[PDB]
Amino acid sequence: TRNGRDSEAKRLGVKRFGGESVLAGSIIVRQRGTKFHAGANVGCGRDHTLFAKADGKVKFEVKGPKNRKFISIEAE
Amino acid sequence: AKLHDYYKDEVVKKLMTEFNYNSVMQVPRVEKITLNMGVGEAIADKKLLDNAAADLAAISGQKPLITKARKSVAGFKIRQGYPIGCKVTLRGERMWEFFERLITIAVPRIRDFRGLSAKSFDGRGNYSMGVREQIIFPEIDYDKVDRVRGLDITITTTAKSDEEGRALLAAFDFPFR
Amino acid sequence: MLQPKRTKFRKMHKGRNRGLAQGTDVSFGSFGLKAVGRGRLTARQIEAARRAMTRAVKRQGKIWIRVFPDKPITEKPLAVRMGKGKGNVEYWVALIQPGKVLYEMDGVPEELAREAFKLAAAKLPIKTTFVTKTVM
Amino acid sequence: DKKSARIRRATRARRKLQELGATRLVVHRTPRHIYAQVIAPNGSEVLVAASTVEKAIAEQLKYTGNKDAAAAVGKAVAERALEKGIKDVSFDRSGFQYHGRVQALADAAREAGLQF
Amino acid sequence: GIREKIKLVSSAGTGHFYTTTKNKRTKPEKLELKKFDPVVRQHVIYKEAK
RNA sequence: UGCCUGGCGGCCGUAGCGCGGUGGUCCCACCUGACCCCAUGCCGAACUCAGAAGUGAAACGCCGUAGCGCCGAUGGUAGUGUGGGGUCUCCCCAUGCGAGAGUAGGGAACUGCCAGGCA
């Protein structure tokens, strides 16, 4: 019934994959909820956007007793 | 604490030999008696809510919390977080003194009284009951009444079965069924 | 007529009919009717083929329907241009793969099973064959 | 449950100090005794540990756990910490209130000269 | 619309003001907030919420 | 060094649940008392104080048990990149990678620092 609307697709997804050396302040994954969680040297933004807090490589880990995914940054 | 001393002297040694426990701490014991009053009618008029508070605080000896409602549904005509009842939980010295005043003056002066029900257990060893026509309570005067009110006397017991809950009241002598 | 009583959404895309079937063995009765070809079974075809066998296998035994349509097909009516949104739902179809057991029957002789399944194979738009329950 | 409600209460304060990489001072309270441990930021090893179940502390105490005992063992951990020099540890209340022996163990260690 | 605009005026000598919105229909009470005045470089009393 | 117990972790169900048995010198748990420090959106239940009369019940720790959760091959099947072909709505052939589910089976965790008790 009277359909036919669609919004601008927000540019989500992973912007910095694992093994990439990023700068301090770079955006790794743009996301709505906590699909990915903050870990070592990774800050969580206001809109749950995970960013870098230190210069290093992106490391994906699955830790915790609830089997949740994490993003950590090891020193290069 | 007349029945608290009566508990340690008579009730503990009675259940020690009846159900042959290996530890003396395996005895059933009372934890709390939650004096409740679900007034309910306070959607229309709020003056019966304040009167219910003072009547439940006359049966007990301390101030209650006006209880907020559980979950807002439309078919039951209640709102989320709505003041609709009041309760008092008694633990310690207030618990033993009220339990004596319950069984010897309030319970026998019930008209048409034949006995409580010996099967009014929850399934794990706790007993809930009510007593009718609250004039039987000596605190409420007959001139200060507004309407018949409510009360849910529940005996919280650390026992693991209903049979252990039966024998604990037997030492409190619970007049009979 | 076999159709869903309630769906979360009214319309559904066209899709494809690729892949192999999963309804391989008879697990309710002893006799079955297995599809050989590939295609779609509409709501009228499933209803008519149930009526086609039931006439000859009179009221004893038991018949199962192993499939369910769960897929609507819309049509655009005559003298209507293309566009103007998707058309209205007309009939329900079922995606059928080669190897799907469609029709089952139990409590009948084997000779009676050969007759009724032959009478129901003509109403189906795809080729079928006769199968029998194998254990394990 | 009694114990598991204490664990989930502290868990927000536990993992917050893990995100900062600081050394935390956890406490365990008992009607009998009381515990206090200085833990490395990895969490798998400790550096300063002194309790009231040790006979060195319980001799000077009338009862094993009270506000006087938490002042004794609060100093005792803090005196062993200054001999090691961990010097600005963090304080983990570990699910208890900051009102009683948890406060008494903390204020005694503040008096010795630790930075928290 | 229904939502009106107000200006939080500093109680000090400076005439610096912030802006915000309040509901005049159900909340006629004057707002009381402490905000940073960048002229006097302190936190001061803000008043006059219409 | 062994045994037992506590604390914080690594790990995140081969670490869970249920059933059966067992532990109190120490430990922990309940328990005792509470005018008070305080606490309750009522309530010494929780919170928290002061004590040790009592006890291994509830809970917790350990051992045992395959009812359940979970882990999980080998082979095979579905699918697919590239190329080729057919009866071209679909499928096959050459080569590369390999499921899901299910079966055999595994499985009643393992490990680090430190403290206490016993020998």
Add this chain to the structure above:
RNA sequence: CCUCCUAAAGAGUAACGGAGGAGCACGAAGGUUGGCUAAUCCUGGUCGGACAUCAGGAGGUUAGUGCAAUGGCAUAAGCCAGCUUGACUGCGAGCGUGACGGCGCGAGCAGGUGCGAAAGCAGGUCAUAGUGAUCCGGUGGUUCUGAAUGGAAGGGCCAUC
């Protein structure tokens, strides 16, 4: 303008394709500190039934989140109380996303505060919609300009309608 799918396991991706929703609300529904754990069902029972409120047990987030939908949420972002105003100002490395105009995230520093004992946290709200570029003026502040000079008018700057 927002949400999901179409979208073919990165992003992007059309149609008079399929389903909705927004032109706000909020001084607490914000910040911080301290606490708290539902949905459903069994049994028990002065008024009391289908529900008024409870007790224990089963169950362990299927509940809830100012609303559309998805992705989140137990350390709870859910709920309650105390104290409050960081819904701070001047800045901002670095980054996402755009043809462009622009939009969005962002630690940290300087100044002065709120809460907590403290480590710390706070530049709005679980996130993603709640919006109108410019010209033209209105209001407040700032000697910046002042068509001979000294003012003033007007304009600009900043705040705002």
Add this chain to the structure above:
RNA sequence: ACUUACCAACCCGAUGCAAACUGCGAAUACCGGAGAAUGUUAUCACGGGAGACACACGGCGGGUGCUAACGUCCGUC
């Protein structure tokens, strides 16, 4: 206080289906790093001048249409 040739929720076992179901899970594609070979820099930045913004069909992955169209709208070649 019980039951009958009655209707029947939840739960349990067996069995399917779903672009807007996922307790599971590829092929390749994509992102980053290292390495050899090969390719007239094929790449990026910047400057001068454009044209083009009506695309077609075929294979494949689809929406729509009748798994009609030398039909239409995308992705890819």
